[PDB]
Design a binder for this molecule. Structure first.
Ligand SMILES: CCCCCCCNCC(P(=O)(O)O)P(=O)(O)O
Ligand SMILES: CCCCCCCNCC(P(=O)(O)O)P(=O)(O)O
Ligand SMILES: [Mg+2]
Ligand SMILES: [Mg+2]
Ligand SMILES: [Mg+2]
Ligand SMILES: [Mg+2]
Ligand SMILES: [Mg+2]
Ligand SMILES: [Mg+2]
Ligand code: NA
Ligand code: NA
Ligand code: NA
Ligand code: NA
Lengths: 361, 361
């Protein structure tokens, strides 16, 4: 789409600005510049640009209905593209660090960044850190005299902390809460008692939904000077809901979508993750199924990993996913209807977000 | 000292505020709260509090010479203690991530955080990330209606990016710049051509000096509303200079101070780091010494590591350190003299910083 190439063109302005500032102010040599260019490209490009392109979609919505000089339209769009790139760079940061914490092997149809031969965990940890400072450098440079700067930085902060807290819920999702202890090596749960819908929901709310839906949506609002034109409690509710669905889909695909289709390789079963599959399976399994699940979950072993998949397929989780999906369609449509009271344009941007999410892979 | 306990008392307000906000807003359970409390304590406490206590020292300086109501004094101090803790928490972040990137084993006389049995690299990477979000949570909560908020956040940003860039110079300091390549596994340098004073200076400027001296000093200025009362080009120069010295000392101690005295275990020789020892040794060695150095540097091997130490001792680097030190005394005193034109009080805070630095371990 033309609009996605126009987005990428702003990626090139930003890359150019960051790398020139490295040379002019940070005493960098061409070879490290080159390494940081390739790192930026590898970690930030080749996704679908969903987060970034949402910020742009929202802004366009308000421009269709709003009186502006042409130079104001151009600036709003550019600000939305820049804000889009903050969020894509924030994602890049999270995926680089996440792939380390998950012992992942592939991302966007390539090796995880830290697995590149000339990278390694040593460098990629820091590269992940650079990725997020860049989001701040962008904000302070591009949005220096913007009315929304302070509101934006503060929202960005808050989304980032929630996501890190959520990551903590995720990485410890396989241990018994009463057993967490810096001093003692953590055992994997044997009862699976904390694999419940409530616990799963909390994990997903934090680790995924703030940065993937709340941020892009409210960002689109901020660059638009349009936050007073929506019910922010509704933005939060619908972002948290669509974001949960997004993760459930992510959980399903980890187990059931071919790696050549997915672009990554699934590790949830081996990582013992609290995925939607695991929770739902335990929500409907009989006594014997639970025992066989417990014997196999959370082991690298191919005969074990494979057994968990047959336990999943045979428990007819498409039924459960279909009823889950149907309830979310209900509730998202409703939240949409509700946002139309104040903001027909925003509600429509939300319909598009929902539709693009609902039919992905 | 009473003043250090008063500092710690603000650490307890902040810990309490962060952890209560975790319970009240982030749906945290007591056991993860407990893990995050212990993590905070382990990574943030038990140092000398040099960075934090500088912010307080500077503020006190201006309070001695400035008319304020008593309630204004109390607030300025509290703001300086809070700003101090931002910097200590930012250090905590850097040391947790640094110890991962350096395969370190001890820190402040204990195991590195990631080596705690119930931690591991998986969790500590994220814990290091949490540490820095906390610095932003503090700033936005404590300094919400402060005139200096925006200037502070922007300085904080800029210091953090420089330090990450510097970390990149550090971690790649042992590879030939023309050989950096994400695609190819990096070889350690055989010529050691980039072990020069200019290259070493650049590494140290960025990785150490911004966060350890520039930030605390200017922070003290910010909380004091006193930035217009100093020559900021002089603050930068003297922070960069004392900070370089600080690192040189850090480089010396890694090789020559007993681990029971130091609180850490040295890995520079084994990591092949571009330390001040390595650079100076190559600055004065003869042909034969260079060859024997090259045969042994950058290997875990105890007979190799040990040989580099004898090459260091026998090359009389105390001579070189003493001439280095003497030149820095000259230049720091001068910068001090120069800061007295505008700010006798600040220059005196700088004398104290210098004196405390100059006589450490
Ligand atoms: C500090 C790191 C924060 C990470 C944010 C959550 C990243 N989640 C996405 C992944 P998840 O399933 O690992 O949660 P993936 O795309 O690997 O399936
Ligand atoms: C993202 C990590 C940034 C790290 C900032 C520099 C940390 N340096 C201090 C250490 P260094 O000698 O490793 O530079 P140590 O105290 O281990 O001697
Ligand atoms: Mg993952
Ligand atoms: Mg993960
Ligand atoms: Mg996943
Ligand atoms: Mg280190
Ligand atoms: Mg280091
Ligand atoms: Mg050191
Ligand atoms: Na211990
Ligand atoms: Na258990
Ligand atoms: Na490759
Ligand atoms: Na070489």
């Amino acid at each position: 789409m033309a609009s996605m190439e126009r987005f990428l063109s702003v990626y090139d302005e930003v890359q150019a600005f960051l790398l020139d500032q490295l040379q002019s102010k940070y005493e960098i040599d061409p070879n490290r510049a080159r390494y940081l260019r390739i790192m930026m490209d590898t970690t930030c490009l080749g996704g679908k640009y969903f987060r970034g392109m949402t910020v742009v979609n929202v802004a366009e919505g308000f421009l269709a209905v709003t009186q502006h000089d042409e130079a104001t339209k151009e600036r709003i769009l550019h600000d939305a593209c820049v804000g889009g790139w903050m969020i894509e760079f924030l994602q890049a940061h999270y995926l680089v660090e996440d792939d380390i914490m998950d012992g992942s092997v592939m991302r966007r149809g390539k090796p995880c960044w830290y697995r590149f031969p000339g990278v390694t965990t040593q460098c990629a940890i820091n590269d992940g850190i650079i990725l997020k400072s860049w989001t701040q450098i962008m904000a302070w440079h591009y949005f220096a005299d913007r009315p929304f700067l302070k509101d934006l930085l503060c929202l960005f902060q808050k989304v980032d902390y929630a996501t890190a807290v959520g990551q903590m819920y995720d990485v410890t999702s396989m241990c018994d809460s009463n057993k967490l202890d810096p001093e003692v090596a953590q055992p994997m749960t044997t009862d699976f008692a904390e694999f419940t819908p409530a616990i799963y929901k909390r994990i997903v709310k934090y680790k995924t939904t703030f940065y993937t839906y709340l941020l892009p949506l409210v960002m689109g609002l901020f660059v638009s000077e349009a936050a007073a034109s929506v019910e922010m409690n509704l933005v939060e509710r619908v972002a948290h809901l669509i974001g949960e669905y997004f993760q459930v889909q992510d959980d399903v695909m980890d187990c059931f979508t071919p790696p050549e289709q997915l672009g990554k390789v699934g590790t949830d079963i081996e990582d013992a993750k609290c995925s939607w599959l695991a929770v739902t399976f335990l929500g409907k399994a009989n006594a014997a199924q639970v025992a066989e699940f417990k014997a196999n979950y959370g082991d690298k072993d191919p005969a074990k990993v494979a057994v968990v998949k047959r336990l999943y397929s045979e428990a007819n989780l498409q039924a459960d996913f279909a009823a889950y999906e149907a309830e979310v369609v209900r509730e998202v449509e409703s939240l949409i209807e509700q946002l139309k009271v104040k903001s027909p344009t925003f509600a429509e941007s939300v319909a598009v977000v929902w539709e693009k999410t609902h039919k992905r892979k």
